[PDB]
Each structure stands twice: as C-alpha cells, then as structure tokens.
Amino acid sequence: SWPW
Amino acid sequence: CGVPAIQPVL
Amino acid sequence: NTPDRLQQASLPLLSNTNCKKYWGTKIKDAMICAGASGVSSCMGDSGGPLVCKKNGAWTLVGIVSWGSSTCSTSTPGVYARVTALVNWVQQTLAAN
Amino acid sequence: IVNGEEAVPGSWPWQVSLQDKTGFHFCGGSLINENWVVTAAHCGVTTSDVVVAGEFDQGSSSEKIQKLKIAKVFKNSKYNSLTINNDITLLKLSTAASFSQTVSAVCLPSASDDFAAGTTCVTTGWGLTRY
C-alpha cells in the first residue's frame, strides 16, 4: 500500500 | 454548493 | 509525471465488509472503499474528491487517501469517509 | 487516475491543486466555501504551499487561475499516521477564493446521510495515469  | 455552472460530461 | 489536464472517472462504492476481503484489518470505520472496477485513483490524486450526486447536488463522500502501491484497477481504493468526519469539519469552521 | 478520461474544463469547480513553492503538484483538495479547502492529512500541507483554483491544464499559461495562500493548517486531531485513519485536513485561506463559473464549492453530507454500496460516484485529479 502507499499513500495516494 | 454542488451544482457546477459548467456541467460535467461522464 | 502527472498529467497536465484534469482527469475524471466514475466508479462504484463498496461496503467496508467486502473491502476487507482485499485489505483486511487495514480498513477502519473512517474509511470507505471505491473502485476495483477498471479504474483507480493513484499517486498525486490524494486529497481530492470522491463525489456522489444526492438530491441533484454533488456531495463529498470521500477524500482520496491510500490503496494499491501500483494503482491496480482490480483492487479498491481507500478514501477518508466524510460522513465520519463532518462533525469535526463543522466544529472547526465554527471556531475559526 | 488510471483509465479515466479528460474532464470538461471547469466542470469540477471545487477541485484544487496543492502545489509546493517550486510549482510541483503534490495533492488535490476541494473548496467547501470561499475560505476553506479540505484535503488529506497525509498530504503534509504547510503554510508555504499554495492552493491553485480554477485550473484545468497545468501546462497552459492562459487559464484564469487563482493562486491562494494558506493562513493555517488544521490537521484533524484524530488523524493516525500509523494507520492513515481519519485522513483529513482543513486549510484556511489567507486570500478568499473568488467564486465564478469555474470556481465554486462542493456540498458536505450530513453525518447521518447514507451512500449505499454499488452507487456510482466520481473521482477527479491530476494523479498518475499509469504506474
């Protein structure tokens, strides 16, 4: 996951 | 609020 | 490189229970999932809107937050759930 | 947005671009009135960043945009950086936006409004179109  | 003057086209 | 021109996409809301099939315990009550439909939000979209029409007006339902690290179009994106947060918005506006 | 399409210019008039001092777009946001923008807490906005309203094509110099300074950043006190929960920040503008055909506010829901699974909604932005 990764911040968008 | 929420009612654009230029209507979106989807 | 981010695109020069503003993009849009339509996409469906999911339930948190179903979104947990993808993301497990990472999904909290102040999140809402959308997508897994052939589109995805991606890096640089964060902070922007997820809007739904309600009684003829576009209403802010989500804030683009996090999701798949490759912006997979078969995995749901995760958005901050504005209904869980709107009391705080109103209190902050009223006090400032 | 991956696999989206170009918007009609001006048709999402609450959409703003958050840019740093070098002019780099790093996050979106939404106008909720002339003085306030909502964005994500994890965007890490500071009072040195700029809100750009009325934009469509970031590569065109011809658009009547508004570059608005930020007076104060209000990060939600329940934001949890470890889980990215409660991911919301309010920006109070130093300079009010001037509403127009291409700049105006999105509605907020009531806390008790319901949006059912399966409803089709829209998202917008200048994020990557391919990873």
XYZ file of all heavy atoms in Angstrom, chain D residues 5-108:
786
model
N -10.613 9.592 -17.916
C -10.725 10.406 -19.118
C -10.571 11.857 -18.764
O -10.761 12.252 -17.621
C -12.022 10.150 -19.844
C -13.196 10.556 -19.028
C -14.531 10.196 -19.616
O -14.591 9.666 -20.737
O -15.552 10.452 -18.941
N -10.301 12.667 -19.763
C -10.200 14.091 -19.545
C -11.545 14.692 -19.193
O -12.548 14.394 -19.839
C -9.660 14.688 -20.825
C -9.160 16.090 -20.730
C -8.495 16.512 -22.022
O -7.444 15.947 -22.387
O -9.042 17.403 -22.668
N -11.568 15.550 -18.181
C -12.781 16.275 -17.811
C -13.087 17.389 -18.799
O -12.191 17.911 -19.464
C -12.605 16.844 -16.430
N -14.353 17.809 -18.825
C -14.717 19.065 -19.463
C -14.094 20.196 -18.636
O -14.259 20.219 -17.421
C -16.234 19.218 -19.542
C -16.624 20.607 -20.010
C -16.847 18.156 -20.445
N -13.377 21.138 -19.261
C -12.756 22.199 -18.475
C -13.749 22.981 -17.641
O -14.789 23.408 -18.125
C -12.074 23.075 -19.522
C -11.879 22.191 -20.693
C -13.008 21.225 -20.686
N -13.417 23.155 -16.372
C -14.238 23.931 -15.474
C -15.417 23.213 -14.859
O -16.137 23.800 -14.060
N -15.609 21.930 -15.200
C -16.805 21.206 -14.783
C -16.743 20.587 -13.384
O -17.750 20.072 -12.918
C -17.178 20.147 -15.799
O -16.205 19.117 -15.882
N -15.575 20.669 -12.736
C -15.402 20.210 -11.356
C -14.853 21.383 -10.562
O -13.670 21.400 -10.200
C -14.511 18.978 -11.284
C -15.032 17.828 -12.059
C -14.486 17.308 -13.177
C -16.215 17.063 -11.803
N -15.230 16.247 -13.632
C -16.297 16.077 -12.797
C -17.215 17.120 -10.822
C -17.327 15.157 -12.835
C -18.226 16.206 -10.853
C -18.277 15.237 -11.853
N -15.667 22.415 -10.317
C -15.142 23.725 -9.961
C -14.599 23.836 -8.553
O -13.928 24.816 -8.227
C -16.336 24.652 -10.199
C -17.527 23.776 -10.019
C -17.116 22.486 -10.641
N -14.870 22.837 -7.725
C -14.297 22.752 -6.391
C -12.912 22.133 -6.368
O -12.235 22.202 -5.354
C -15.222 21.944 -5.463
C -15.703 20.681 -6.063
C -15.089 19.478 -6.145
C -16.965 20.522 -6.719
N -15.877 18.576 -6.789
C -17.043 19.195 -7.157
C -18.057 21.377 -6.948
C -18.180 18.700 -7.812
C -19.162 20.890 -7.620
C -19.208 19.574 -8.044
N -12.494 21.473 -7.453
C -11.185 20.794 -7.457
C -10.070 21.814 -7.434
O -10.003 22.673 -8.318
C -11.077 19.948 -8.723
C -9.705 19.314 -8.923
C -9.467 18.039 -8.145
O -10.171 17.073 -8.270
N -8.409 18.006 -7.348
N -9.158 21.662 -6.493
C -7.952 22.472 -6.441
C -6.732 21.579 -6.565
O -6.780 20.365 -6.332
C -7.872 23.364 -5.178
C -9.064 24.305 -5.128
C -7.750 22.576 -3.911
N -5.625 22.204 -6.955
C -4.298 21.602 -6.956
C -3.500 22.212 -5.811
O -3.460 23.427 -5.681
C -3.622 21.893 -8.287
O -2.244 21.578 -8.273
N -2.861 21.371 -5.015
C -1.932 21.837 -3.995
C -0.540 21.704 -4.564
O -0.125 20.622 -4.995
C -2.102 21.047 -2.704
C -3.541 21.037 -2.163
C -3.639 20.213 -0.898
C -4.124 22.412 -1.945
N 0.152 22.829 -4.597
C 1.486 22.915 -5.174
C 2.462 23.426 -4.140
O 2.129 24.240 -3.296
C 1.489 23.826 -6.399
C 0.672 23.212 -7.514
C 0.488 24.041 -8.719
O 1.221 25.012 -8.946
N -0.486 23.660 -9.548
N 3.686 22.926 -4.214
C 4.728 23.450 -3.349
C 5.314 24.694 -3.949
O 4.886 25.163 -4.997
C 5.769 22.363 -3.050
C 6.617 21.960 -4.237
O 6.673 22.693 -5.215
O 7.277 20.891 -4.161
N 6.312 25.261 -3.276
C 6.861 26.551 -3.717
C 7.557 26.441 -5.063
O 7.714 27.448 -5.722
C 7.757 27.202 -2.686
C 8.938 26.392 -2.281
C 9.976 27.260 -1.593
C 9.496 27.697 -0.234
N 10.642 28.273 0.532
N 7.989 25.242 -5.463
C 8.625 25.033 -6.759
C 7.615 24.850 -7.873
O 8.027 24.688 -9.028
C 9.575 23.832 -6.775
O 8.840 22.616 -6.728
C 10.591 23.878 -5.647
N 6.309 24.848 -7.562
C 5.296 24.677 -8.551
C 4.879 23.239 -8.837
O 4.163 22.965 -9.794
N 5.310 22.327 -7.994
C 5.058 20.909 -8.169
C 3.705 20.542 -7.541
O 3.501 20.759 -6.361
C 6.188 20.134 -7.471
C 6.059 18.649 -7.536
C 6.320 17.963 -8.712
C 5.694 17.932 -6.418
C 6.214 16.589 -8.771
C 5.590 16.538 -6.465
C 5.888 15.882 -7.637
N 2.821 19.971 -8.341
C 1.545 19.425 -7.860
C 1.808 18.176 -7.055
O 2.373 17.213 -7.567
C 0.637 19.109 -9.052
C -0.562 18.311 -8.678
N -1.769 18.882 -8.356
C -0.672 16.976 -8.475
C -2.573 17.898 -8.000
N -1.943 16.738 -8.048
N 1.347 18.160 -5.807
C 1.555 17.002 -4.947
C 0.282 16.399 -4.394
O 0.315 15.272 -3.915
C 2.561 17.280 -3.839
C 2.136 18.305 -2.808
C 1.450 17.916 -1.666
C 2.424 19.647 -2.960
C 1.082 18.833 -0.703
C 2.066 20.559 -1.988
C 1.386 20.169 -0.859
N -0.836 17.109 -4.408
C -2.090 16.594 -3.861
C -3.218 17.425 -4.450
O -3.003 18.510 -4.961
C -2.142 16.679 -2.327
S -1.434 15.254 -1.471
N -4.424 16.871 -4.381
C -5.636 17.612 -4.649
C -6.297 18.096 -3.380
O -5.858 17.828 -2.269
N -7.421 18.773 -3.577
C -8.271 19.238 -2.496
C -9.592 19.690 -3.075
O -9.741 19.738 -4.300
N -10.517 20.063 -2.197
C -11.824 20.556 -2.605
C -12.183 21.810 -1.828
O -12.114 21.834 -0.602
C -12.922 19.522 -2.372
O -12.683 18.332 -3.065
N -12.660 22.831 -2.542
C -13.244 24.000 -1.892
C -14.596 23.640 -1.281
O -15.449 23.079 -1.959
C -13.459 25.108 -2.917
C -12.179 25.822 -3.347
C -12.342 26.433 -4.721
C -11.779 26.874 -2.323
N -14.792 24.038 -0.026
C -16.097 23.873 0.642
C -16.788 25.214 0.870
O -17.980 25.236 1.166
C -16.024 23.018 1.905
C -15.098 23.610 2.940
C -15.642 21.586 1.547
C -15.198 23.001 4.313
N -16.064 26.311 0.721
C -16.604 27.671 0.719
C -15.429 28.552 0.258
O -14.385 28.032 -0.144
C -17.247 28.067 2.046
C -16.275 27.987 3.174
O -15.131 28.460 3.080
N -16.676 27.363 4.263
N -15.613 29.862 0.260
C -14.589 30.736 -0.295
C -13.293 30.773 0.518
O -12.254 31.192 0.006
C -15.117 32.150 -0.458
C -16.339 32.286 -1.338
C -17.690 32.142 -0.606
O -17.797 31.466 0.461
O -18.671 32.716 -1.124
N -13.350 30.344 1.779
C -12.237 30.489 2.688
C -11.561 29.185 3.109
O -10.554 29.254 3.801
C -12.696 31.234 3.963
C -13.196 32.615 3.672
O -12.435 33.451 3.261
N -14.489 32.817 3.798
N -12.109 28.040 2.718
C -11.675 26.757 3.286
C -11.598 25.688 2.216
O -12.491 25.526 1.381
C -12.649 26.313 4.377
C -12.669 27.136 5.610
C -13.462 28.205 5.875
C -11.897 26.916 6.787
N -13.222 28.662 7.140
C -12.275 27.884 7.732
C -10.920 25.975 7.157
C -11.735 27.914 9.010
C -10.399 26.009 8.419
C -10.811 26.962 9.331
N -10.511 24.908 2.301
C -10.257 23.748 1.461
C -10.127 22.519 2.325
O -9.477 22.554 3.367
C -8.970 23.965 0.640
C -8.520 22.713 -0.087
C -9.185 25.093 -0.357
N -10.712 21.422 1.897
C -10.475 20.161 2.550
C -9.548 19.314 1.687
O -9.629 19.312 0.464
C -11.820 19.515 2.905
C -12.580 19.048 1.683
C -11.638 18.410 3.915
N -8.624 18.629 2.356
C -7.667 17.754 1.728
C -7.370 16.598 2.672
O -8.037 16.429 3.697
C -6.418 18.545 1.284
O -5.560 17.724 0.493
C -5.620 19.078 2.441
N -6.390 15.769 2.315
C -5.967 14.650 3.162
C -4.890 15.111 4.120
O -3.970 15.857 3.755
C -5.438 13.511 2.317
N -4.955 14.644 5.365
C -3.918 14.942 6.338
C -2.548 14.444 5.910
O -1.531 15.113 6.166
C -4.267 14.390 7.707
N -2.481 13.292 5.252
C -1.182 12.735 4.920
C -0.487 13.520 3.817
O 0.692 13.291 3.564
C -1.281 11.236 4.564
C -1.649 10.968 3.153
N -2.930 10.658 2.740
C -0.894 10.992 2.039
C -2.914 10.508 1.434
N -1.698 10.705 0.981
N -1.179 14.434 3.137
C -0.524 15.296 2.159
C 0.525 16.200 2.775
O 1.388 16.702 2.050
C -1.549 16.126 1.416
S -2.551 15.199 0.232
N 0.472 16.444 4.078
C 1.538 17.197 4.732
C 1.630 18.646 4.296
O 2.736 19.197 4.245
N 0.503 19.270 4.031
C 0.494 20.654 3.623
C 1.053 21.542 4.740
O 0.820 21.297 5.923
C -0.937 21.073 3.253
C -1.006 22.516 2.831
C -1.465 20.199 2.109
N 1.787 22.571 4.330
C 2.238 23.620 5.231
C 1.785 24.961 4.698
O 1.304 25.091 3.583
C 3.760 23.644 5.378
O 4.331 24.098 4.153
C 4.328 22.293 5.791
N 2.022 26.013 5.494
C 1.676 27.371 5.071
C 2.604 27.902 3.980
O 2.354 28.992 3.484
C 1.646 28.318 6.248
O 2.915 28.276 6.874
C 0.542 27.958 7.243
N 3.629 27.156 3.565
C 4.443 27.523 2.415
C 3.924 26.998 1.090
O 4.420 27.376 0.039
C 5.869 27.037 2.654
O 6.426 27.651 3.819
N 2.927 26.120 1.125
C 2.336 25.590 -0.080
C 1.239 26.525 -0.588
O 0.850 27.457 0.091
C 1.802 24.186 0.210
C 2.878 23.212 0.611
O 3.941 23.187 -0.030
O 2.610 22.407 1.529
N 0.776 26.277 -1.806
C -0.164 27.148 -2.499
C -1.348 26.342 -2.973
O -1.193 25.219 -3.439
C 0.563 27.823 -3.727
C -0.333 28.722 -4.530
C 1.788 28.572 -3.241
N -2.540 26.917 -2.873
C -3.762 26.338 -3.419
C -4.019 26.975 -4.770
O -4.118 28.191 -4.872
C -4.939 26.582 -2.476
C -6.266 26.178 -3.110
C -4.751 25.876 -1.146
N -4.160 26.165 -5.805
C -4.443 26.666 -7.147
C -5.863 26.264 -7.513
O -6.187 25.077 -7.613
C -3.430 26.160 -8.170
C -3.726 26.759 -9.541
C -2.012 26.510 -7.734
N -6.715 27.272 -7.690
C -8.124 27.096 -8.043
C -8.344 27.530 -9.483
O -7.651 28.396 -10.011
C -9.019 27.898 -7.110
N -9.345 26.925 -10.116
C -9.727 27.305 -11.471
C -8.874 26.703 -12.545
O -8.991 27.097 -13.699
N -8.033 25.734 -12.203
C -7.114 25.136 -13.143
C -7.758 23.988 -13.913
O -8.625 23.255 -13.408
C -5.912 24.645 -12.355
C -4.766 24.054 -13.142
C -4.121 25.016 -14.094
O -4.749 25.307 -15.107
O -2.985 25.452 -13.807
N -7.303 23.828 -15.132
C -7.637 22.664 -15.946
C -6.369 22.010 -16.473
O -6.087 20.844 -16.186
C -8.595 22.998 -17.090
C -8.777 21.858 -18.057
C -9.381 20.679 -17.646
C -8.297 21.935 -19.356
C -9.519 19.605 -18.524
C -8.427 20.868 -20.230
C -9.043 19.706 -19.820
N -5.617 22.764 -17.266
C -4.415 22.294 -17.932
C -3.212 22.961 -17.281
O -2.951 24.153 -17.471
C -4.501 22.652 -19.424
C -3.383 22.087 -20.256
O -2.319 21.786 -19.712
O -3.576 21.970 -21.483
N -2.480 22.182 -16.502
C -1.328 22.705 -15.778
C -0.177 23.117 -16.683
O 0.769 23.765 -16.230
C -0.852 21.702 -14.726
C -1.899 21.482 -13.647
C -1.431 20.742 -12.425
O -0.271 20.386 -12.319
N -2.309 20.527 -11.480
N -0.238 22.745 -17.957
C 0.759 23.128 -18.950
C 0.410 24.357 -19.755
O 1.214 24.773 -20.580
N -0.753 24.949 -19.533
C -1.187 26.156 -20.212
C -1.074 27.333 -19.247
O -1.410 27.229 -18.092
C -2.642 26.008 -20.640
O -3.165 27.278 -20.974
N -0.620 28.465 -19.767
C -0.348 29.714 -19.003
C -1.495 30.667 -19.236
O -1.445 31.798 -18.742
C 0.934 30.460 -19.436
O 0.907 30.747 -20.826
N -2.519 30.217 -19.973
C -3.572 31.100 -20.469
C -4.802 31.088 -19.570
O -5.688 31.940 -19.722
C -3.976 30.686 -21.893
O -2.876 30.743 -22.785
N -4.871 30.123 -18.649
C -6.070 29.910 -17.835
C -6.161 30.894 -16.698
O -5.123 31.239 -16.128
C -6.044 28.531 -17.234
C -6.252 27.485 -18.295
C -6.527 26.150 -17.716
O -6.996 26.061 -16.561
O -6.293 25.181 -18.408
N -7.388 31.357 -16.388
C -7.584 32.351 -15.331
C -7.642 31.630 -13.998
O -8.697 31.274 -13.455
C -8.810 33.219 -15.556
C -8.633 34.232 -16.681
C -9.746 35.271 -16.710
C -11.089 34.702 -17.154
N -11.109 34.292 -18.592
N -6.466 31.381 -13.478
C -6.361 30.654 -12.242
C -6.232 31.609 -11.067
O -5.909 32.777 -11.247
C -5.189 29.644 -12.274
C -3.836 30.314 -12.554
C -5.469 28.565 -13.317
C -2.628 29.398 -12.390
N -6.469 31.092 -9.882
C -6.276 31.807 -8.647
C -5.272 31.040 -7.833
O -5.486 29.869 -7.526
C -7.591 31.931 -7.893
C -8.647 32.696 -8.667
C -9.975 32.739 -7.959
O -10.033 33.012 -6.751
N -11.053 32.517 -8.702
N -4.188 31.694 -7.455
C -3.172 31.114 -6.588
C -3.371 31.705 -5.218
O -3.191 32.910 -5.018
C -1.777 31.400 -7.120
C -1.506 30.759 -8.460
C -0.052 30.904 -8.874
C 0.317 29.848 -9.905
N 1.783 29.628 -10.005
N -3.776 30.875 -4.275
C -4.252 31.310 -2.985
C -3.304 30.846 -1.901
O -2.913 29.684 -1.831
C -5.641 30.735 -2.762
C -6.642 31.109 -3.858
C -7.874 30.221 -3.830
C -7.036 32.564 -3.799
N -2.916 31.763 -1.043
C -2.058 31.472 0.078
C -2.827 30.858 1.222
O -4.019 31.098 1.399
C -1.350 32.754 0.516
C -0.334 33.242 -0.490
C 0.320 34.550 -0.057
C 1.495 34.940 -0.953
N 1.095 35.278 -2.348
N -2.119 30.057 2.009
C -2.680 29.328 3.121
C -2.314 30.042 4.424
O -1.155 30.278 4.696
C -2.146 27.892 3.138
C -2.547 27.162 1.858
C -2.620 27.141 4.375
C -1.841 25.847 1.646
N -3.333 30.367 5.215
C -3.136 31.023 6.508
C -2.805 30.038 7.618
O -1.962 30.326 8.464
C -4.376 31.798 6.918
N -3.497 28.900 7.661
C -3.338 27.947 8.755
C -3.793 26.584 8.295
O -4.721 26.470 7.508
C -4.111 28.376 10.007
C -3.851 27.491 11.232
C -4.277 28.097 12.560
C -4.105 27.122 13.725
N -4.485 27.698 15.039
N -3.106 25.571 8.788
C -3.383 24.181 8.517
C -3.996 23.564 9.768
O -3.402 23.621 10.842
C -2.087 23.438 8.113
C -2.345 21.976 7.831
C -1.438 24.102 6.911
N -5.172 22.965 9.615
C -5.887 22.289 10.687
C -5.952 20.815 10.387
O -6.832 20.339 9.689
C -7.309 22.846 10.855
C -7.391 24.281 11.258
C -7.326 25.288 10.330
C -7.581 24.606 12.588
C -7.449 26.617 10.714
C -7.690 25.924 12.985
C -7.625 26.925 12.042
N -5.010 20.084 10.927
C -4.993 18.660 10.792
C -5.953 18.072 11.815
O -5.931 18.458 12.971
C -3.553 18.249 11.038
C -3.232 16.821 10.902
C -1.685 16.615 10.838
C -0.937 17.159 12.033
N 0.455 16.673 12.094
N -6.810 17.143 11.421
C -7.722 16.529 12.369
C -6.967 15.906 13.529
O -6.051 15.162 13.337
C -8.549 15.449 11.661
C -9.675 14.927 12.514
O -9.529 14.743 13.683
N -10.830 14.770 11.954
N -7.339 16.238 14.750
C -6.689 15.741 15.943
C -6.772 14.229 16.087
O -6.003 13.682 16.861
C -7.274 16.434 17.201
O -8.679 16.232 17.194
N -7.690 13.551 15.412
C -7.758 12.108 15.440
C -7.008 11.435 14.317
O -7.010 10.200 14.241
C -9.208 11.629 15.432
C -9.974 12.051 16.653
C -11.250 11.244 16.792
C -11.970 11.539 18.097
N -12.509 12.931 18.184
N -6.342 12.194 13.452
C -5.539 11.585 12.408
C -4.499 10.668 13.031
O -3.792 11.047 13.954
C -4.861 12.662 11.577
C -3.886 12.128 10.569
C -4.272 11.226 9.606
C -2.568 12.521 10.590
C -3.370 10.748 8.678
C -1.665 12.062 9.659
C -2.061 11.162 8.708
O -1.179 10.676 7.765
N -4.415 9.454 12.500
C -3.452 8.448 12.947
C -2.528 8.145 11.795
O -2.924 7.494 10.838
C -4.198 7.225 13.416
C -3.281 6.167 13.993
O -2.157 6.016 13.570
N -3.761 5.435 14.969
N -1.290 8.633 11.873
C -0.296 8.481 10.788
C 0.124 7.033 10.609
O 0.658 6.673 9.563
C 0.951 9.324 11.122
O 1.545 8.790 12.263
N -0.049 6.201 11.626
C 0.377 4.806 11.549
C -0.561 3.985 10.682
O -0.118 3.134 9.937
C 0.508 4.195 12.920
C 1.825 4.672 13.701
C 1.753 6.100 14.199
C 2.036 3.719 14.816
N -1.865 4.259 10.789
C -2.894 3.530 10.045
C -3.507 4.342 8.890
O -4.287 3.813 8.113
C -4.015 3.120 10.991
O -4.582 4.312 11.546
C -3.515 2.193 12.113
N -3.157 5.612 8.817
C -3.736 6.555 7.875
C -5.246 6.661 8.075
O -6.000 6.932 7.156
C -3.310 6.329 6.392
C -1.839 5.927 6.292
C -3.576 7.567 5.562
C -1.328 5.713 4.908
N -5.715 6.570 9.290
C -7.107 6.748 9.598
C -7.425 8.192 9.961
O -6.596 8.915 10.501
C -7.546 5.816 10.729
C -9.041 5.626 10.785
O -9.732 5.643 9.770
N -9.539 5.368 11.982
N -8.662 8.600 9.685
C -9.125 9.981 9.891
C -8.278 10.960 9.081
O -7.804 11.972 9.581
C -9.193 10.367 11.366
C -10.047 9.421 12.154
O -11.203 9.232 11.856
N -9.445 8.778 13.154
N -8.121 10.641 7.799
C -7.158 11.298 6.918
C -7.746 12.560 6.303
O -8.046 12.610 5.117
C -6.690 10.313 5.872
C -5.504 10.808 5.055
O -4.841 11.760 5.479
O -5.234 10.190 3.991
N -7.858 13.615 7.118
C -8.474 14.872 6.690
C -7.768 16.043 7.357
O -7.458 16.010 8.552
C -9.998 14.878 6.963
C -10.670 16.094 6.349
C -10.305 14.788 8.444
C -12.177 16.065 6.413
N -7.542 17.072 6.549
C -7.014 18.363 6.953
C -7.864 19.446 6.332
O -8.296 19.330 5.187
C -5.539 18.512 6.542
O -4.779 17.808 7.501
C -5.053 19.935 6.420
N -8.087 20.522 7.087
C -8.684 21.741 6.587
C -7.618 22.799 6.427
O -6.758 22.974 7.291
C -9.761 22.247 7.543
C -11.091 21.542 7.479
C -11.923 21.865 8.692
C -11.826 21.946 6.225
N -7.695 23.536 5.328
C -6.825 24.674 5.053
C -7.656 25.924 5.090
O -8.631 26.041 4.348
C -6.190 24.544 3.669
C -5.495 23.235 3.382
C -4.992 23.202 1.955
C -4.368 22.965 4.350
N -7.295 26.870 5.947
C -7.908 28.183 5.957
C -7.082 29.071 5.051
O -5.871 29.201 5.255
C -7.994 28.752 7.367
C -8.752 30.069 7.415
C -9.020 30.559 8.814
C -9.813 31.857 8.777
N -10.092 32.369 10.139
N -7.712 29.670 4.054
C -7.031 30.506 3.100
C -6.787 31.894 3.649
O -7.612 32.444 4.352
C -7.841 30.580 1.823
C -8.129 29.240 1.153
C -8.982 29.451 -0.089
C -6.845 28.513 0.793
N -5.645 32.475 3.295
C -5.297 33.844 3.634
C -6.068 34.839 2.802
O -6.399 35.936 3.245
C -3.801 34.055 3.380
O -3.387 35.317 3.844
N -6.208 34.433 1.543
C -6.855 35.135 0.476
C -8.086 34.322 0.071
O -7.932 33.179 -0.339
C -5.876 35.251 -0.734
O -5.260 33.978 -1.024
C -4.770 36.257 -0.439
N -9.303 34.871 0.208
C -10.503 34.120 -0.185
C -10.515 33.866 -1.672
O -10.090 34.706 -2.472
C -11.763 34.862 0.206
N -11.031 32.711 -2.053
C -11.296 32.448 -3.434
C -12.430 33.332 -3.929
O -13.342 33.664 -3.185
C -11.692 30.996 -3.606
N -12.353 33.703 -5.192
C -13.415 34.423 -5.864
C -14.220 33.430 -6.679
O -13.719 32.886 -7.662
C -12.820 35.490 -6.776
O -13.843 36.211 -7.428
N -15.460 33.170 -6.264
C -16.263 32.176 -6.961
C -16.736 32.732 -8.294
O -16.959 33.929 -8.451
C -17.424 31.698 -6.062
C -17.034 30.693 -4.984
C -15.719 30.295 -4.752
C -18.024 30.106 -4.224
C -15.439 29.323 -3.808
C -17.729 29.151 -3.266
C -16.432 28.754 -3.071
N -16.874 31.828 -9.248
C -17.098 32.158 -10.644
C -17.682 30.940 -11.319
O -18.001 29.935 -10.669
C -15.760 32.525 -11.316
O -14.939 31.355 -11.403
N -17.778 30.982 -12.638
C -18.211 29.817 -13.368
C -17.328 28.601 -13.130
O -17.830 27.487 -13.139
C -18.281 30.108 -14.851
C -19.489 30.933 -15.206
C -19.703 31.059 -16.690
O -18.896 30.606 -17.513
N -20.810 31.677 -17.046
N -16.033 28.807 -12.933
C -15.084 27.712 -12.827
C -14.552 27.457 -11.419
O -13.703 26.578 -11.261
C -13.907 27.949 -13.786
O -13.266 29.168 -13.422
C -14.353 27.975 -15.235
N -15.021 28.209 -10.431
C -14.562 28.078 -9.040
C -15.768 28.182 -8.130
O -16.416 29.217 -8.103
C -13.516 29.152 -8.700
C -13.045 28.983 -7.268
C -12.320 29.085 -9.638
N -16.094 27.120 -7.411
C -17.239 27.086 -6.525
C -17.122 25.870 -5.613
O -16.149 25.134 -5.701
C -18.556 27.153 -7.291
O -18.702 26.077 -8.178
N -18.068 25.682 -4.699
C -17.922 24.727 -3.622
C -18.653 23.427 -3.848
O -19.728 23.385 -4.452
C -18.431 25.334 -2.322
N -18.105 22.365 -3.288
C -18.782 21.070 -3.211
C -19.652 21.042 -1.955
O -19.359 21.731 -0.981
C -17.747 19.927 -3.206
C -16.966 19.838 -1.912
C -18.378 18.594 -3.544
N -20.730 20.241 -1.959
C -21.526 20.081 -0.751
C -20.913 19.081 0.205
O -20.309 18.102 -0.218
C -22.957 19.632 -1.079
S -23.900 20.736 -2.103
N -21.104 19.286 1.492
C -20.792 18.301 2.507
C -22.041 17.502 2.814
O -23.157 18.034 2.794
C -20.296 18.995 3.766
C -18.945 19.679 3.592
C -18.663 20.515 4.830
C -17.863 18.647 3.357
